[PDB]
Design a protein around this nucleic acid. Sequence first.
DNA 1: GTTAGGGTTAGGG
DNA 2: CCCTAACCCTAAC
Length: 57
Amino acid sequence: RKRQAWLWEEDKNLRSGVRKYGEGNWSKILLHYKFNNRTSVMLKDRWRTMKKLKLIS
DNA sequence: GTTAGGGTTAGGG
DNA sequence: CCCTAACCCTAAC
């Protein structure tokens, strides 16, 4: 079962989540907007890798 | 349960 | 063996 690579549905939705409900508020983001099967851990570590190299918030 | 960084597994090069 | 990245662990909140 090949590991799922995040798509813009998830990532673009996440970016919206960060802007509309704050970055470090993955709970709120998960409540407001749905994803395939993500957690606070997933969302945060995704955004972590992203900002670490690209620097967005 | 969530949050936050450390760190391994998966993926591709 | 390196980079980016999804998963997984340790630690703290």
